[PDB]
Amino acid sequence: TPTLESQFDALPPDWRAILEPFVASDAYAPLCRFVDGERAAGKAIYPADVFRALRLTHPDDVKVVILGQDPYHGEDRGIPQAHGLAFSVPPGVRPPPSLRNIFKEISADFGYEAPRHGCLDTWASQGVLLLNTVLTVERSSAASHAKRGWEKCTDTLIHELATRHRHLVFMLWGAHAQAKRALFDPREHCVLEAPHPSPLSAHRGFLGCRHFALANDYLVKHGRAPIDWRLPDAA
Ligand SMILES: [Cl-]
Ligand SMILES: [Cl-]
Ligand SMILES: [Cl-]
What whole-number distance in Å separates Cα of residue 209 and Cα of residue 177? Predict the structure, then answer.
């Protein structure tokens, strides 16, 4: 796996500019040494492609920001669930319960069928930034990995993105994601809040929130093409 610094350096210039306050901070080198040292010590740290969400969705192309907290720490048939996009799972992995509830809301909102798989790459290529606020995890451990270092980084990301690009849609699910409103001006953006889609909270108001339809209304209001919330038949 490339060192974390090399993964920061490989980002497009537009993302590097948004992350520069963090990369210039005292927290950057320690985060890099921690993640690199965990891998060097033989721990199963996921995903390998830490910034996949950013590589697939460049800043100018961001339309919708969907926050997760930690990457999945589980696996399915020996394939890790985390692959660098919030909520998404790679081809060959069954959708976990939170993602099934996301799909249930889309199916109810638009009448689409339940997808065959859980890979959200094709939403990222349409401008859906699928950003976990903590971007690494240790296999089978629910403990957040480098929580404080990563959140300094993704806090910088959210603030700088939102300050440079007006009229984004933010889907903020759960209290942790909703607290990220402190990082931007909510009158300049569409802020959609609901409980988290996990089964523990989904029936408190995630199911029924209509966020995917609301997001598309706001995009069209601002002259942008709406998201196709379907998924192609194969991943
Ligand atoms: Cl370059
Ligand atoms: Cl700049
Ligand atoms: Cl710092």
Answer: 16
